Design a binder for this molecule. Structure first.
Ligand SMILES: OC[C@H]1O[C@@H](O)[C@H](O)[C@@H](O)[C@@H]1O
Ligand SMILES: OC[C@H]1O[C@@H](O)[C@H](O)[C@@H](O)[C@@H]1O
Ligand SMILES: OC[C@H]1O[C@@H](O)[C@H](O)[C@@H](O)[C@@H]1O
Length: 353
């Protein structure tokens, strides 16, 4: 076997042997095909602290990037989490307007092993982006927003922290909703706008708003993008009073209806979540929000709430490194770093008269 012959030679060149004079024994090599992260298990008498001292050398000899080395069941077992030197993705990928797609409704979120990650909002209409504060979870949503604003979409932005996440420059290109009263008015409007669009599709025999628009020269329905900076501000009802709770229940009813029924109507939800919790990322959100973007979470439960697998615990500690899940596959990718100070140019959008 190639791998066993390759490891043996590598260990012998280092005289990397235990008290019994044996080089480490390969017990198992488990590759994750989507993330390209491997679990290599070795048996030897070499202490874990010695393996850790050898990390720089083992990376070079075996041609791998070592994420971690941990002791297994016994002091004879080491488990290495690694990525092959061939599984290359950037560690920094600045946004650039050259990535903007010609096809309306198609957005790019970053780079994977073979090509870029593209999302066609006409096929997978809603996105949930989850990550710890500073991960880049929110940066991705603003990058998607910019792309859609450049394709002529209408935007609505929700931020209950006084709108500090969507400053005055965002207000030039759309409406910023900063409190629960304005959010009830917004979501009741979007649910009615969705109902009016479904009515137009049935009546005209149109599959989507794109087919509808071609039928009427002077009647052009535009894509609507709704960016929710933090889903917990709309879903977490724990400490509010009776009236605010009923208002949030009404809003949740509107969000659920929107997510489930806005597939063909060109109304897209881009949701941010800082702390995954089953009360916030419910079964209704999961059943109707197909795109998941997940940052690193050391906790298994947090990854299962977002992805319904534990792979977010395996990611390397790289800023802007995420998991992408659409359907049954989970892949690792580097997200674009979109910086408002240099990438968000409101006058370019306003010029699209
Ligand atoms: O990389 C292969 C496997 O390694 C294991 O350590 C992880 O828990 C799995 O999520 C992963 O699929
Ligand atoms: O469809 C465009 C891209 O997005 C996803 O379907 C996959 O994760 C990528 O491998 C693909 O290149
Ligand atoms: O926030 C709700 C309001 O949003 C505006 O953008 C729409 O034009 C109004 O019709 C709607 O009532």
């Amino acid at each position: 076997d190639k791998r066993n012959a390759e490891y043996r030679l590598a260990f012998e060149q280092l005289n990397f042997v235990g008290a019994d004079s044996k080089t480490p024994i390969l017990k198992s090599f488990i590759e994750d095909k989507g993330t390209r992260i491997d679990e290599i298990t070795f048996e030897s008498m070499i202490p874990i602290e010695t393996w850790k001292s050898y990390i720089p050398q083992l990376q070079t000899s075996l041609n791998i990037s070592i994420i971690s080395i941990e002791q297994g069941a016994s002091k004879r077992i080491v488990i290495i989490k690694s990525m092959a030197g061939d599984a290359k993705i950037p560690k920094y990928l600045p946004w650039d307007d050259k990535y903007i797609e010609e096809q309306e409704g198609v957005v790019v979120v970053g780079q994977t092993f073979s090509g870029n990650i593209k999302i066609d909002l006409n096929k997978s209409p809603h996105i949930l982006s989850a990550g710890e504060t500073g991960s880049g979870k929110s940066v991705i949503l603003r990058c998607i927003l910019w792309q859609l604003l450049k394709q002529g979409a209408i935007a609505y932005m929700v931020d209950f922290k006084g709108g500090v996440e969507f400053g005055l420059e965002y207000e030039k290109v759309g409406q910023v909703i900063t409190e629960v009263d304005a959010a009830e008015k917004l979501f009741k409007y979007l649910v009615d706008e969705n109902a009016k669009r479904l009515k137009l599709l049935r009546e005209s025999g149109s599959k989507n708003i794109g087919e509808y628009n071609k039928k009427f020269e002077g009647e052009e329905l535009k894509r609507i993008i709704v960016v929710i900076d933090e889903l917990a501000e709309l879903m977490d009802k724990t400490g509010v009073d009776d009236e605010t709770r009923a208002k949030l229940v009404r809003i949740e009813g509107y969000t659920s209806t929107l997510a489930r029924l806005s597939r063909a109507t060109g109304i897209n939800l881009c949701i941010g979540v800082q702390r995954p919790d089953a009360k916030v990322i419910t079964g209704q959100i999961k059943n109707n929000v197909p795109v998941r973007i997940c940052g690193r979470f050391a906790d298994s439960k947090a990854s299962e709430i977002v992805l319904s697998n534990t792979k977010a615990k395996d990611l390397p500690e790289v800023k802007g490194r995420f998991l992408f899940k659409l359907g049954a596959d989970t892949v690792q990718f580097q997200a674009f770093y979109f910086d408002d100070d240099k990438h968000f140019i409101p006058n370019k959008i306003l010029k699209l008269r």
